[PDB]
Amino acid sequence: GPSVFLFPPKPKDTLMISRTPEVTCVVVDVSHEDPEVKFNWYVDGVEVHNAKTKPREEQYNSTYRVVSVLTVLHQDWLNGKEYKCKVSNKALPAPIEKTISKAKGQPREPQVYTLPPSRDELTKNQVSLWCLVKGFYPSDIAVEWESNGQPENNYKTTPPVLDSDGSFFLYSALTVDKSRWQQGNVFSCSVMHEALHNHYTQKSLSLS
Numbered sequence: 001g002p003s004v005f006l007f008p009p010k011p012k013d014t015l016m017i018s019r020t021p022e023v024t025c026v027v028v029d030v031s032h033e034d035p036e037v038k039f040n041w042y043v044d045g046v047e048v049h050n051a052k053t054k055p056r057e058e059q060y061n062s063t064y065r066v067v068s069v070l071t072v073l074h075q076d077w078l079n080g081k082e083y084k085c086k087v088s089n090k091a092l093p094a095p096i097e098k099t100i101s102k103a104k105g106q107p108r109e110p111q112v113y114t115l116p117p118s119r120d121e122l123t124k125n126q127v128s129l130w131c132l133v134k135g136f137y138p139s140d141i142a143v144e145w146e147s148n149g150q151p152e153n154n155y156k157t158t159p160p161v162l163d164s165d166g167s168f169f170l171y172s173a174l175t176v177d178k179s180r181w182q183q184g185n186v187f188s189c190s191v192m193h194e195a196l197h198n199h200y201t202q203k204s205l206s207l208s
């Protein structure tokens, strides 16, 4: 018969105001004979009616994949609300219920350190600026760079690495033309994580 899977939002989506985090309820092994799926959604056991029904997608094995997507509020996900997908389809004797919520664990605030470009990096016409982020739990984090109210995109960020104390660290390296740095322009590292005040912190650096 048909089988159900319930996915959380992408972790970065729950920390970024520029994203809409979604809980996604996927039904597979839906037959061509009985292809209609009914979804009910509950947030902490209270029904809601704003889910999006997606068009069913033909899979290459005599079945449909049927999906319902429920937008969640950033704060609702971060405050631990429980999202329940209830699925119905003639092939099933009774409805399938699945529930998902944010993982538990004691959260820990990242500490953010900016580092000016090295002494080797100077002889070249581009310099890299570093933003070291450490001591954070859980691993879910977003890191961006900006300057003069505008995004800076020439950066690489390591995925989070697990430390022996149970927390995570990473670095982000932004590369920029040396002239911009030598001109006294201010580059900012932005970090979004569930444990920061306002879920958002920023550190700047510029030349002395």
Ligand SMILES: *[C@@H]1O[C@H](CO)[C@@H](O[C@@H]2O[C@H](CO)[C@@H](O[C@@H]3O[C@H](CO[C@H]4O[C@H](CO)[C@@H](O)[C@H](O)[C@@H]4O[C@@H]4O[C@H](CO)[C@@H](O[C@@H]5O[C@H](CO)[C@H](O)[C@H](O)[C@H]5O)[C@H](O)[C@H]4NC(C)=O)[C@@H](O)[C@H](O[C@H]4O[C@H](CO)[C@@H](O)[C@H](O)[C@@H]4O)[C@@H]3O)[C@H](O)[C@H]2NC(C)=O)[C@H](O)[C@H]1NC(C)=O
Residues within 6 Å of the ligand: 003, 005, 007, 008, 009, 010, 013, 021, 022, 023, 024, 026, 028, 029, 059, 060, 061, 063, 065
């Ligand atoms: C007929 O053919 C189809 C496809 O060809 C088959 O369909 C498959 O059925 C399987 C069940 O038998 C099922 O297996 C489970 O898979 C899950 C993992 O699924 C994810 O990863 C897979 C790749 O590894 C993908 O195939 C899936 O698409 C899925 O990817 C996730 O998709 C999310 C939903 O869209 C997506 O989240 C959203 O993404 C958007 C961005 O676009 C937003 O961010 C939004 O907010 C998100 O919510 C994610 O990006 C993505 N996530 C991840 C993590 O990949 C797996 O967990 C599960 O295993 C667990 O459960 C079993 C219990 O059965 C347990 O035993 C295991 O140990 C484990 O705990 C299953 O393996 C397949 O997923 C599914 N494939 C598809 C494409 O639907 C049929 O099975 C075929 N029929 C037959 C008879 O053969």
